[PDB]
Design a protein around this ligand. Structure first.
Ligand SMILES: CCCCCCCC/C=C\CCCCCCCCCCCCCC(=O)N[C@@H](COP(=O)(O)OCC[N+](C)(C)C)[C@@H](O)/C=C\CCCCCCCCCCCCC
Lengths: 98, 263
């Protein structure tokens, strides 16, 4: 049985233009563990992204945290892009800020 | 509770790590085949020389277990690609194994038992797993003797880190998908530890029961994050506030008010 990833995107601190921050993409509830996760800046892949060691929950579904340090400007859009066997096409979830 | 998890993926990738619940405390380095300590106190009160003992059975059993799974895959009817997951530890002790993300077999007292629903495949697996009783007795003692002693030393050694209090910060934003004529108010709470937290949209002292709390999500620095949202009619968004309560604030709630440029 395959399980599709839940994808949640958030910043460590309130967004303030010109101030250093951390962008997070938490991917969870998926199976099998093979997965591809990119953080995007203006549709372009962000080069140095870190992730937690792969782990799983009680129901055996996997979860990973992806993150990077970043400084937002008013012109920049960020998102998390996920590909997994359960997905027809990569799924993109934007960082929502005001 | 302390537990070790094993993730093995076959198409031959292998991951072993140790956990205090959500908190990772140990990792296994394949290249060095060593036990990596993620915190100073991850050693617990286990002497430096006793730690190389533990590494030994971890040495031999991790790659004997990985190797063992692929020769038998034929008779066990494991078909590529597939994944095996194991979790074992103590709180009471446990050791459970899944095949393709479903309960498959578990270790109970002195032997491996198949989950009934897992069928004859799990039964044939247990036969293999139980073919040497001594190796099962070692598994028993690791769980009922070694694991309980370890977790005591671990908790004591880490007490400082584990009972620390880190204050949350919070902020408000507009949510993305309100229905027509309505707004979505979002209250973000971040940087708190430990995990339990209280957050509600309020009108004065009246809790707004429309408040929808999301999952509590991790940050890389080991603190936690939560979003709480409220859907309201645009006419009725006056006098709303977000109130955060947390052990670390000692009664001084964080309170933020919907207004300024938010309106
Ligand atoms: C990052 C590490 C942190 C460590 C911190 C430690 C502190 C706390 C310590 C302990 C807490 C509890 C941990 C629980 C560990 C439980 C160990 C599991 C026992 C494994 C059974 C080995 C059987 C074997 O090793 N099985 C070998 C048998 O080889 P053999 O030729 O010995 O068999 C011949 C026996 N006769 C002498 C009678 C002929 C294999 O061919 C069979 C079956 C393969 C299936 C095994 C895979 C499933 C094992 C599940 C566990 C795998 C990884 C566990 C470690 C993560």
């Amino acid at each position: 049985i395959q399980r599709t990833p839940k994808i949640q995107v958030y910043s460590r601190h309130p967004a303030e233009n010109g101030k250093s921050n951390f962008l997070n993409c938490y991917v969870s509830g998926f199976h099998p563990s093979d997965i591809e996760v990119d953080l995007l800046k203006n549709g372009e892949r962000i080069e140095k992204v870190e992730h937690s060691d792969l782990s799983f929950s009680k129901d055996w579904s996997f979860y990973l945290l992806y993150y990077t340090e970043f400084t937002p400007t008013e012109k920049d859009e960020y998102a998390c892009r996920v590909n997994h066997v359960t997905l027809s096409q990569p799924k993109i979830v934007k960082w929502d800020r005001d | 509770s302390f537990h070790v998890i094993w993730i093995a993926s076959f198409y031959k990738q292998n991951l072993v790590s140790g956990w205090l619940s959500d908190l990772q405390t140990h990792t296994w380095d394949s290249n060095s085949s060593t036990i990596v300590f993620l915190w100073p106190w991850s050693r617990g009160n286990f002497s430096n020389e006793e730690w190389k003992e533990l590494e030994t059975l971890f040495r031999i059993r991790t790659i004997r277990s990985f190797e063992g799974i692929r020769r038998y895959a034929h008779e066990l009817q494991f078909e590529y690609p597939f994944e095996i997951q194991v979790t074992g530890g103590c709180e009471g002790s446990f050791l459970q194994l899944a095949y393709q993300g479903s309960d498959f077999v578990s270790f109970q007292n002195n032997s491996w038992l198949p989950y009934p629903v897992a069928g004859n495949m799990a039964k044939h697996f247990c036969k293999v797993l139980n073919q040497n009783q001594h190796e099962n007795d070692i598994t028993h003692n690791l769980l009922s003797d070694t694991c309980p002693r370890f977790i005591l030393g671990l908790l004591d050694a880490g007490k400082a880190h584990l009972q620390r209090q880190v204050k949350p910060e919070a902020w408000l934003s507009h949510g993305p998908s309100p229905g027509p004529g309505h707004l979505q108010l979002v209250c973000h709470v971040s940087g708190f530890y430990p995990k339990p937290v209280w957050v509600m949209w309020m009108r004065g002292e009246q809790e707004q029961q429309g408040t929808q709390r999301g999952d509590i999500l991790p940050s890389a620095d080991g603190t936690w994050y939560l979003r709480a949202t409220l859907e309201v009619a645009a006419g009725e968004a006056a006098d709303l506030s977000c109130r955060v309560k947390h052990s670390s604030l000692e009664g001084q709630d964080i309170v933020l008010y919907w207004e300024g440029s938010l309106v």
